[PDB]
Every structure is written in C-alpha cells, then in structure tokens.
Design a protein around this ligand. Structure first.
Ligand SMILES: Nc1ncnc2c1ncn2[C@@H]1O[C@H](CSCC[C@H](N)C(=O)O)[C@@H](O)[C@H]1O
Ligand SMILES: Nc1ncnc2c1ncn2[C@@H]1O[C@H](CSCC[C@H](N)C(=O)O)[C@@H](O)[C@H]1O
Lengths: 238, 229
C-alpha cells in the first residue's frame, strides 16, 4: 500500500503517534528535497525523519529544485517506482512537511494512486501556520473570527486588500514577495508574526519589523497578520 | 510549577502528537472542557479522547459549561504556585477557536509559566479522512465559524473557492436548502476520528441527519478528488 504520512511542521515531537508508527513500519520512504546550484542536498523532511531511528536505506529522496517547483513533475516521475513496491506487496508512505493535504505535492501521488486502485491513505499532521501560532504563544482564532490563508501571492497588493475584510490572514511560501515584505510591514501599521523554520534547528520568529530589514526570507517562512498577535509573548502588549 | 495548553488533536487518539502525549503523562493535574445541557447530561469529547491514553483517572479535572468557567483558574493558579505541572487540554488545536485561549491569557496576565503545544485542527483531519486535499498550489482557504446567517457562506463562496465552516448549529436548519442550490462538491464531516464518526459528500445523507456541534463543512472543488464524491 501507499500512505501519505504527514510529519508535522519541523519539531519531530509534533509528529502524531499514528504517523510515527506508520513510518517505523514502511518498507520504503520517499521524502522531498532541494539542490541549490552545485549539488549538496537540503531536505527539511529528511531532517525530521533522521530523528525517528529509521533504516537509512528505506528512504528515497525526490529532488529537482525550487522554481514553479517542478515538484508536481518530480513526484510523478517517482510514482512509477511506487506502483512497484506496492505490486510487490511492500508498504510505501510519502511524507509531507506539515500536513499532507495542505499545499502538499503528495496530493499528486494519492489522486493518482486512487483511480489506479492501490490501498492508499492520508495521515494528517499539524500545518506550519498552526505550529507558528503556538510557538508565539498566541491564539490564531477566537469565537466567530474568520481565518484566511493565502499562498504564492503575486504581489503584496493582494495581502493589503484581504486585510480589511478578514480577521486573521496567513500568507505562505513567502520567497515570492521576499522583496516587498518590509515596506509592506511598515504601511500596515498593525501587529504581525513572521515565522521561519518553526520547530526546526534554524527557527526564527519575530514581531519586529527592524528584525526583518536585512533578513533573507526563505521558502520555509510564513506571515500571520492578526490583532491576536498582541497576545503573543513576542508582543510588548504582553 | 507550570501550566501548559496541551492540544489533543481532533478525536482519534493516534492523532495526538508524541510531545502532547508525553506532557499529559507527566502532568500532575489535567483540566478538560465539557458541556452540561439544560437537563444535566454531560458531553465531553475531550474526556473521550483522554480516556484513550491510560492516564491516572484521579488527575483529571472537568471544567463544565452550559450547552463563566474561565474562572477555573484557581485551582490552576493554586496548583502551579504549589510546585505542580498543570495541563489544560483542547480538542483539535489549542489556538484555533479554543477556549483554552482564555485560560492561557489569564495565566500569563499573572506571573505564570505557560506554553502551547499545537494539535491537528478538525478541518485538517476531515480532509485526510475523506482522502482529499484541502489546498493546492496558490489556492486560498477561508475558515468561517458560528456564522450569523447562511448568507455569510454563500457570499464567501463566490469569492473564495475552498471555504470551511465550523460551529454549524447556528445554521443547521438551513443546510440542506443551501446545498441543493450550491449544487457543487462538498464534504460533511461529523465527529472525525471519534466513535460515531460520519463523513459524507451526499446531500441525501443529510436529509434525515441530525447535525450536531462537532461537525464541520468543507465546500471545495477538491472534494471531487475524494473516494466519496
Ligand atoms: N516549519 C515551517 N516554518 C515556517 N513555514 C513553514 C514551515 N513548514 C512549512 N511552511 C510553510 O509552508 C510552505 C510550503 S507549502 C507546504 C505546507 C505544509 N504542507 C503545511 O501543512 O504547513 C512554505 O512556503 C511556508 O510558508
Ligand atoms: N472531531 C471533530 N469532528 C468534526 N468537527 C470538529 C471536530 N472537532 C472540532 N470540530 C469542529 O470544531 C468546532 C469547535 S471550535 C474547536 C476547534 C478545535 N480547536 C480545532 O482545532 O479544530 C466544532 O463546532 C466543529 O465544527
């Protein structure tokens, strides 16, 4: 069978009991990764998997890099071998950072596993934006709030318009408006959370625009704009 | 001592995080939410989850509300000052329409050591249970809760393609009327991962159906990518 196993967003302790047992029992793994102009691999998913004491030879990397991302194609070029351990009776999981049905490319493997037969399942995980809220010690939503989550916005204008109609707004992937961010956070003169590599080795979370002026805004970062940011341990309002 | 907002996840005990489980097992005292109706019957899905982890039963403290209780802060203040590890639990995630949020704010409002361990929201568990994605490359996701009238949802659905609706009890009588006129893919998800889970993408399955507090609605084109469409 093939199982879409959510890892949670970075802290290995944030994997579910179920997802962890599913990893320990899989015959082969399948994790996404990135190469950044020369080779040498970066994989936030493998960084998590490394803490579970899994057999290193079960893990199958899925690589070509950050772009579109071309991720859709990359997974597709690996499902062929996924419908082969499966026909040979083996347990295949395909891991996702955060949750496997929340902006995950794993959603191509499962949509294709169904229609093709083959016993497939999704085990859910904690979205990054959820873990970010908790890392900052704030609520994301209270009583009747709406929450809007956006991804891959094409220019900062989009965030600005959404921000008068909605309670909380969450913006993911953020190396897309990485150059517009500080100017945006200056206008909008309102509380925000910037959260990078939540639960991972290089975690960085801030509510200070000053702290972002010279910061490189990488793929694994998100923004929360919400009056609830005033409740964070990171806010002067306490 | 200290106080921790521990998220339980949304119902299936296997969906608690390893960390949250560790923290419950180490807690001296665990406070959990529940409701008591006009008749005196108690409902507590948090305790239903808790009863799946082999915790010492004597350490569990109910905080029962009609259906104000943010007042339970003594005994918690009481316990922490005393040196004890207090846990306050939430179904799903504790910062996502959770009333643990009230306790934590009050807790830090005093000197107290507080932290939040996240959990999986029920809308997330629902998409996974149905075998469908909630979001792909560039989609927006809109979550509404306790909408004041059904118009809210219609208005949202024209300008947003994936809309989740949560405390649906405010709008329960209007649901089937709405779905026949929407005439598009949807997921109804009730008590996901709990005894009596019921998941449907069929309007006929909702006609004789009583729609309770722990249900949510996902309206998304992506519901067609499920097994149950
Ligand atoms: N640990 C983390 N910290 C900050 N952002 C993260 C993150 N993990 C994932 N993200 C966000 O997720 C985007 C990739 S889309 C994948 C989302 C993941 N499936 C989830 O459930 O959250 C990144 O651009 C970033 O905005
Ligand atoms: N197991 C479950 N199944 C279906 N709906 C659930 C659920 N748990 C919570 N809900 C939804 O959550 C609403 C309560 S507000 C609590 C939300 C919880 N903190 C979370 O993170 O999901 C309910 O009205 C219902 O819409």
């Amino acid at each position: 069978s093939i199982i879409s196993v959510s890892l949670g967003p970075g802290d290995p302790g944030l994997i579910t009991v179920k997802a962890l047992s599913q990893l320990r029992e899989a015959d082969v793994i399948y994790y996404p990764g990135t190469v950044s102009a020369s080779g040498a691999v970066t994989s936030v998913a493998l960084d998590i998997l490394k803490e579970f004491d899994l057999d290193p030879s079960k893990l199958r990397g899925m690589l070509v890099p950050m772009s579109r991302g071309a991720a859709e194609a990359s997974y597709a070029a690996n499902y062929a071998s996924m419908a082969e351990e499966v026909q040979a009776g083996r347990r295949v999981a395909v891991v996702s950072v955060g949750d496997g049905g929340f902006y995950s490319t794993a959603s191509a493997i499962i949509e294709r596993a169904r229609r093709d037969g083959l016993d497939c399942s999704m085990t859910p995980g904690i979205p990054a934006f959820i873990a970010a809220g908790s890392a900052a010690g704030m609520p994301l939503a209270l009583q009747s709030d709406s929450v809007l989550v956006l991804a891959q916005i094409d220019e900062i204008g989009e965030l600005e318009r959404a921000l008068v109609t909605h309670s909380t707004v969450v913006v993911m992937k953020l190396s897309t408006v990485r150059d517009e961010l500080v100017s945006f956070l200056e206008r909008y003169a309102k509380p925000f959370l910037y959260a990078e590599k939540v639960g991972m080795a290089g975690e960085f979370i801030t509510m200070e625009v000053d702290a972002l002026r010279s910061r490189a805004i990488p793929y694994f970062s998100l923004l929360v704009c919400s009056p609830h940011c005033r409740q964070s341990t990171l806010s002067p309002f306490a």
